[PDB]
């Protein structure tokens, strides 16, 4: 369904090279996330099947009001907007990490990433 494919476009990058500032600047443009510039956007790396599994008891627990939190940790990169303007050119600073993630699930699929844990 459409919301799951959208989640993948905004939040999934299987095998990144360097996860530096330039990686952020370039993937944000590539994925169509720069008019206007998103203030922060996080990408998850690794196995697509582990991500889907957060929606079942296999790799997730219930979390807060309507969310799920993963049991396994993932490689992630947060891209944060540097500077005052929300209009291109968008300068980004990258922060690489390794921890569990929080999603919303609908009909068995992740449709939303909770980004409050990367702020």
- Two tokens, residue 21: 């500032």
Q: What angle do CA 68, 71, 73 make, to 5 degrees?
A: 110
Length of the chain: 119
Q: Hey, which CATH number is domain 1-119, 1.10.3720.10, 2.60.120.10, 3.10.130.10, 3.40.50.1000?
A: 3.10.130.10
Resolution in A: 2.1
Which SS3 state, helix, strand or coil, does residue 77 take? strand
Residue with tokens 């947060």: 78
Q: Where are the domains of the chain?
A: 1-119
Method for this entry: X-ray
Catalytic status, residue 45: no
* Active-site residue, selected from the candidate residues 11, 45, 63, 82: 11
Q: Name the residue among 30, 11, 35, 16 with its Cα closest to residue 114.
A: 11
Q: Do residues 4 and 10 make contact, with C-beta atoms less than 8 angstroms apart?
A: no
Which listed residue (6, 63, 82, 112) is catalytic? 112
Q: Residue 113: which of 69, 75, 49, 74 has the closest Cα?
A: 69
112 annotated active-site = yes
Strand (E) positions, 1-119? Answer: 40-44, 60-63, 67-70, 74-82, 91-99, 102-106, 109-113
- Give the C-alpha separation, 45 to 55, whole Å: 17
3-class SS of residue 117? helix
Specify whether the CB–CB gap between 102 and 68 falls below 8 A: yes
- Exposure class string for 32-46: b at 16+ Cβ within 10 A, else e: ebbeebbeebbbbbb
């Amino acid at each position: 369904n459409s919301r799951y494919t959208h989640f993948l476009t905004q939040h999934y990058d299987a095998k990144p090279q360097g996860r530096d500032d330039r990686y952020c600047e370039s993937i944000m443009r590539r994925r169509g996330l720069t008019s206007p510039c998103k203030d922060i956007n996080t990408f998850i790396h690794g196995n697509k099947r582990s991500i889907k599994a957060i929606c079942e008891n296999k790799n997730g627990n219930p979390h807060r009001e309507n969310l799920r939190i993963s049991k396994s940790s993932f490689q992630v990169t947060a891209c944060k907007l540097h500077g005052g303007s929300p209009w291109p050119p968008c300068q980004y600073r990258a922060t690489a990490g390794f921890r569990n993630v929080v999603v919303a699930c609908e009909n068995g699929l992740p449709v939303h990433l909770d980004q409050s844990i990367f702020r």
